[PDB]
Amino acid sequence: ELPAPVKAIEKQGITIIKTFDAPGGMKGYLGKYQDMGVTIYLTPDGKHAISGYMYNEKGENLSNTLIEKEIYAPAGREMWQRMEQSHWLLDGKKDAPVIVYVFADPFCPYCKQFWQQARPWVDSGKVQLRTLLVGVIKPESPATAAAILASKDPAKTWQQYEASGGKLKLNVPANVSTEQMKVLSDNEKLMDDLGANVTPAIYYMSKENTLQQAVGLPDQKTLNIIMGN
Amino acid sequence: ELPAPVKAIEKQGITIIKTFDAPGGMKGYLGKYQDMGVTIYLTPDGKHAISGYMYNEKGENLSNTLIEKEIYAPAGREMWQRMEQSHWLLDGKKDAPVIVYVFADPFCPYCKQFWQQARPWVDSGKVQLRTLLVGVIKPESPATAAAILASKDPAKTWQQYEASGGKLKLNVPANVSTEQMKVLSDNEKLMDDLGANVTPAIYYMSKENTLQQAVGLPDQKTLNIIMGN
C-alpha cells in the first residue's frame, strides 16, 4: 500500500490527490485537509514523511506554488474565460497588463466609487477595467443599462456615466433590443454562476492565476491588490 | 552562514534555537514562530528545506514529540519539583501512578466539587490528589486551613471536610502555629508563582511531562485528562 509514514498522516485527516516528484530522492504527495491543500514528503530513508512546506535556495515556497497552481486555481479558469468571451466595455488601454472584470448596475453607488478609485491605475495604462453590465437593482436598471449599450460609443458613455455619478443624461430607446437583452441576461447568469449577486462584483487574477473576488467597495489594501500593485 | 533555504524560512518569522540530527541524511533545525515551536528539515540535495512535521512508520509525530519535550515542557519542571517538596496532604494510594496537585482553600465551592468529581479515580487507586492548602479567600480561611493541618490526621480531616461540603466541625486552636503559617505562606507563594490566584488551581503532567494547569471546576473533558484517562 502507501508508505506507512504517509498512511499515518492520512489518518490525521488528509485525503491524497496524487503523487509528484520532489528533490533529494524524496517523493511528494499532494493532498487536502478539509479545504486546505497540503504537501507531504517521504524522506530518503523511506521510513519517515514530513507534512509541511518546502522552500528552495531562492526562498520560494514551492509547496505554496504547487498548491495554488494545482488545487486552488484550476476550477475558476473556465469562468475567467467566459468573462473574456462576454460583451464587456473597455475602460483603459487595450494593452494594459492587468485585467479586471466588474459586474456593474447603473444604479449602484459603490460601482461608481470603485470606478473613481481605479482612475490612477487605468489612466497610467497599467490596468484595464472590463465592465459586464447587468440590470438587477432597480426597475429602470435594465433599460438604463441597455441605453448605455445602445449609445454610439458604449464604453465612453459608461465612463461618463460613472464619472458623473449617474447624472449623465441619456437617450433611452423605446425598448430594449434583443441583442442588448441577450447581453444583460447572459451577464447576469454568469455573475450568478460566480457566486455574488451584489454589485459591484469584481474579479481579478492573483496567486498562480487563482480567480479572485471582491464584492462591494474594496478597502485600500484590496484595491491595491486588485490593481496588481 | 545558514543554508539559503533555511535562511528563507527564518525571514518568514522564525527564530532558530538549535540544530539536531534527523533521518535520511537530513539536518534538523528547531525553532519558534511567535510562541509556537517549529521544526525545519534540510533536504539531501541541500538546496531545499521543509518546515513541517515529521512522522515515522509507527505513526508518531516526531516533530511534536521533540517540540513538547524541548520547548513547551522544560520551564515548568522545577515548579513540579517545588510542589513535590511542599507540605501536601495525600488523598489516594501513595503508589497511585497519576499525581495531581491542587491548591485549595477551605471556603471554596469548586474545590469541594472537584474533590467529589475525582472520587472514581482516587478510589480505584489510579490517581492520588496532593493538596497544598492556602488561606486566601475568607477572613477565617487561614485559621480553618491551619486547624485542618493541626488535626491528628490532617489528610483524613481534609477528606472529611471536602466530603461534607465544609460542614465538618473542627477544633480551631487559639492561634495559627508558626509551622502551619509557614506552610500556608509557602504554598500561597508557590501558587502565585504558578500564575493562578483562583482556587482550585489544579496541576498535572501531560504532553511529554509538560506542566498543565486547570483553574476552577474542570468540565468533563478536562477532568478526564487531568485524571490521566
Reply yes or no: is the peptide bond before residue A200 cis, omega within 30 of 0. Answer: yes
Dihedral pair phi/psi, residue B169, rounded to 5°: -80, 145
CA A164 to chain centre: 27
User: Which of A24, A45, A51 is opposite residue B52, by nearest beta carbon?
Assistant: A51
The resolution in Å comes to 2.0
The CATH T-level fold of domain B86-229 is Glutaredoxin (3.40.30)
A36 at B interface, C-beta within 8 A: no
SS3 state of residue A206: strand
B215 at A interface, C-beta within 8 A: no
Question: Which residues from chain A sit within 8 angstroms of residue B46, using beta carbons?
Answer: 24
Boundaries of every domain in chain B: 1-61, 62-85, 86-229
Task: Name the method of structure determination.
Answer: X-ray
User: Which of B5, B26, B60 is opposite residue A43, by nearest beta carbon?
Assistant: B26
Relative to beta strand B14-21, strand B27-33 is antiparallel
Looking at chain B, which residue has its C-alpha nearest residue A8?
Answer: B59
Question: Which residues from chain B sit within 8 angstroms of residue A62, using beta carbons?
Answer: 48
Dihedral through CA B105, CA B107, CA B112, CA B113, nearest 10? -110
User: Which of B25, B45, B59 is opposite residue A8, by nearest beta carbon?
Assistant: B59
C-alpha cell at B116: 467529589
A139 at B interface, C-beta within 8 A: no
B29 at A interface, C-beta within 8 A: no
C-alpha cell at A51: 507534512
Number of other residues whose CB lies within 10 A of the CB of residue B197: 13
Q: Please judge whether B24 and A11 are an interchain contact, meaning their C-beta atoms are less than 8 angstroms apart.
A: no
Number of other residues whose CB lies within 10 A of the CB of residue A58: 10
A11 at B interface, C-beta within 8 A: yes
Stated as kind and residue range, the H or E segment containing B100 is strand B98-104
Question: Which residues from chain B sit within 8 angstroms of residue A4, using beta carbons?
Answer: 57-59
Taking the C-alpha atoms of residue A106 and residue A172, their distance in angstroms, rounded to an integer, is: 13
Question: Which residues from chain A sit within 8 angstroms of residue B26, using beta carbons?
Answer: 43-44
Taking the C-alpha atoms of residue A115 and residue A91, their distance in angstroms, rounded to an integer, is: 10
What angle do helix axes B77-84 and B178-193 make, rounded to 10 degrees? 160
Residue type, B21: D
Taking the C-alpha atoms of residue A67 and residue A33, their distance in angstroms, rounded to an integer, is: 12
Distance from CA of B25 to the nearest CA of A (A): 8
Question: Which residues from chain A sit within 8 angstroms of residue B44, using beta carbons?
Answer: 24-26, 44
The answer to whether B65 and B92 have CB atoms below 8 angstroms apart is: no
Please state which CATH number belongs to domain A1-61.
3.10.450.70
A219 at B interface, C-beta within 8 A: no
Please state which CATH number belongs to domain B62-85.
6.10.250.150
Q: Which residues contact A18 (CB under 8 A, 6 or more apart)?
A: A29, A30
A13 at B interface, C-beta within 8 A: no
Number of other residues whose CB lies within 10 A of the CB of residue A110: 17
CA B108 to chain centre: 20
Question: Which residues from chain A sit within 8 angstroms of residue B51, using beta carbons?
Answer: 52-53, 55
